[PDB]
Design a protein around this ligand. Structure first.
Ligand SMILES: [Mg+2]
Ligand SMILES: [Mg+2]
Ligand SMILES: [Mg+2]
Ligand SMILES: [Mg+2]
Ligand SMILES: [Mg+2]
Ligand SMILES: [Mg+2]
Lengths: 382, 382, 382
């Protein structure tokens, strides 16, 4: 039993301060979220900040809202050894860079880290699905950290540490072949920095077919938009057709842009939920259910999240300031049907049927289907 | 915890009168149904009747028990524009006709409508699966109508309307580029016809590889039967091998016919449930569980539904009047193992094993496996 | 909500004596098991013993811990008729033999039987997954027997019989074309032998592409090991790459061997649970969760089961007597990431990152990643 009668424009619910930045998490107990099995997290990493490496029981999609940095994402059995510059030496994983507009992927059980190499704050919008095929435990999100001693808030409910602090000193000294002084550091008993630490002194690093697929796609301003309306705005899709790895995690996203008074035509997604996060501006959004009842009718403002349930019809209209968002989909290929427009449910319908449907005349029925010239996004024609 | 100790021959539980016909729905809270995540609906559309277009969160299979008509089933991204006869003009979807014996398909999130073009009553047996991969909400069925103001009984639990009545007048006037008088019709505020309306005056319409697959298969009298016994009756299968689109919705069906005193040999389906709906006559049916206990032993009469749980052994015997049914399967390819017959679990067994199994002799064991000459259906050999 | 805070080294919880041996079952209500949807059963079949044929609603993997015998596993629609030796005659299924080290497969809904043809006791470790795609009922295990009258303990909660005892005498006499005296034997009303009966007098039997795939793989001593450490021990994998049929049931296993004081390096499986059953010796095992808390820290002794949750880090160290186990995986291909070793999460990490991670120096960070020479299993380097 899913309670989708009162959707709400959600704001983060908890905060966790770290040495080099902070972490905000949404209410996983929200009825919409609970029903779809989603979690939202926003990381704000200050310059020279490093988000320690950890892995989760659920696939993640991460949207870079601001800044640029480098990440390290392993991936099981994937040979990735690399030899640094002047090579004494070191062998490491590929150093992957990213910038604003980047939609990064993180498969379940895969550890990763991120570092802000820029001077502005690195803001990351993390979307996790717990009802994903990949997670065999429960609809509850878990992050397993490799270093540090982080206050587990990615889900909350406790002196939580990293995966090593639960192990016996002896055991760890053997496995790694090290002294107890090292087991102390490993366990990070005293680390009071949390999950985003300050990178000390200097950071020089800045250079089975599965092992070859791209782990990101930029759906930002500096890329073509699949749906484009010069006067209205646009939507840039990132599904498995454009990013193969998406078929694996079974997630996808849409980055949308609306100009002043621009409106997204009524529609619903037939095969997935749509966890919308507003990245800029604000808009009036209306969602309706199968009862023909309004389950949401208000404003979504920058920094907020509105979970649009699968099949629920919706309509969006940006404020004078315009509206910009990143919509995560719980399917590798979200299909959106239009109710009004060049290609609509309406257009598909015979005039004879539309007539009897709305007790209108074949002529009025005509103004009904052909009256709308545009497509997905509508240019200020209020 | 599924309560499958007391199956029952179910009758519809609710009724909804419409202008041009009515709608009956079974008890979705029935223990069998609840466990399998199934819903049953029977539409009775009178001549000149139109079942307004709507879409559901779950895949549907529809069996035409009586009559013939035309449907309009869109399907996302599937170009389907068509230009009517003397073309002023109109562009619409393919006009798909159907007759008795037709097993129609309706993928989740796809809207469709049906119209009775015949003079007899058009009777439709709708089977919906909510525990289908395609539905990401909950095991509760939802139908989203595009026009009218229908009393939501496809699940019941309220002034329920169509998807537009939950939207603001302004919003709808823009999206469609219409006057408020039209928004009034669209919202169908006063429509008191329910879901099956009377087609007014005259109805002339009567003419990505996914977009090319068949959306129906006739498993009626005018088609060969995969399993046939001249003296007993037969069973016509409709799985993904015969109808590709079935692999998508992950449903399939079997239309069966039994002559007087004909019996379907004991058997169980290894990979799915079997939601049997009797279309004619009646029969004595016995189901047994893994405890060797009878979980059903009685009569299934025309118009009733018996949900045979996966792996449950069953036996059927038609009355003197014979027995005819349409069995929906919750898998694209239901596999049925036989207990007695030419190809049986018994036949596969070595006489030495059968002996020790039933403390009988190799000779008696012989009369046990080879004693049954026939196959699936058995001709009156009572 | 999965309770994985207190894993435990489980022992069977119930016993069922049969004529020719006995059956032990683990507590399916155990929190770990319940969360992963697993069941454990151990059959001990004495010489000349036959485990009557039955089928389950869930896929099974069976490990032969001791002895050797022959089985009969049908498989739906798979033509398998075979004509015995001096042929009066008999047509039966393929007679499949097996020995110690054999990991047998039993798809859901498929009946099978086993017979001990050796002189030692035939010990079978049966692993069943109820949360497997193949089972459409509930997370509760069910076995449907064809003969005998077994006390249903494979799940317990009753005069439980075989699938025929729930059917009317008349019905069974027709289906099979037999006398009521035979229906009496079939129903096994008086059979008081339970599920493992004594094979009487003499047992001579001892000779769609799906129908051609292997139904077993030996991961015992007389086979190469994918992971091998001369001084430590090894692990023999059985996934879909080595046994195709595994991709169907979506299960796999690992047979491991540890020499005195040998240790399995820290690690976690990213895509499945690991239901470990100790076949010999004992070891100290430590599991840690995402909170960095120890959710298990003790001894696993021969005959016991420890369910290692997905993503949970673990470490194993054999006693002086060594440790040997069979680990069932709830996925057709369990991927294990290493924390310390030649190919580790550690090795993948840049020295610069490891430094800031454990507030250690680039040199100490060096001894951290390259300090461990070995791989999965570690030779006594305590
Ligand atoms: Mg949109
Ligand atoms: Mg959205
Ligand atoms: Mg049948
Ligand atoms: Mg049936
Ligand atoms: Mg291991
Ligand atoms: Mg294990």
């Amino acid at each position: 039993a899913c309670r989708l009668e009162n959707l709400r424009a959600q704001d983060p619910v908890r905060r966790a301060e770290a040495e080099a930045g902070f972490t905000e998490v949404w209410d996983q107990d929200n009825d919409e979220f609970q029903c779809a099995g989603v979690n939202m997290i926003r990381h704000t990493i200050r310059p020279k900040g490093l988000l320690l490496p950890g892995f989760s029981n659920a696939p993640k999609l991460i949207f870079v809202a601001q800044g640029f940095g480098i990440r390290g994402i392993a991936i099981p059995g994937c040979a990735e050894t690399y030899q640094t510059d002047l090579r004494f030496k070191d062998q490491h994983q590929k150093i992957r860079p990213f910038r604003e507009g980047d939609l990064l992927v993180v498969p379940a059980g895969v550890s990763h880290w991120m570092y802000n190499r820029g001077q502005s704050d690195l803001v990351l919008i993390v979307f996790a699905d717990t009802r994903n095929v990949a997670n065999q435990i429960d609809p509850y999100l878990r992050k397993f950290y490799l270093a540090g001693r982080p206050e587990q808030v990615e889900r909350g409910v406790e002196k939580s540490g990293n995966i090593f602090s639960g192990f016996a000193d002896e055991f760890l000294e053997e496995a790694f072949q090290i002294d107890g002084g090292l087991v102390r550091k490993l366990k990070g008993e005293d680390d009071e920095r949390d999950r985003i630490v300050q990178v000390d002194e200097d950071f020089e690093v800045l250079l089975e077919t599965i092992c070859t697929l791209r782990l990101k796609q930029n759906i930002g301003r500096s890329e073509r938009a699949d749906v484009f309306n010069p006067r209205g705005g646009r939507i840039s899709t990132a599904n498995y057709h454009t990013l193969p790895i998406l078929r694996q995690v079974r997630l996808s996203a849409e980055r949308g842009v609306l100009y002043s008074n621009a409106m997204v035509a009524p529609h619903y997604t037939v095969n997935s939920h749509s966890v919308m996060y507003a990245t800029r501006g604000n808009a009036r959004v209306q969602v309706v259910d199968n009862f023909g009842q309004s389950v949401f009718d208000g404003e979504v403002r920058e920094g907020q999240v509105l979970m649009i349930p699968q099949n629920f019809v919706v309509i969006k209209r940006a404020s004078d300031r315009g509206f910009e968002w990143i919509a995560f989909k719980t399917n590798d290929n979200a299909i959106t049907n239009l109710l009004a427009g060049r290609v609509s449910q309406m257009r598909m319908l015979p005039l004879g049927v539309l007539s009897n449907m709305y007790r209108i005349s074949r002529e009025e029925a005509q103004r009904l289907k052909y009256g709308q010239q545009e497509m997905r996004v509508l240019s200020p024609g209020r």
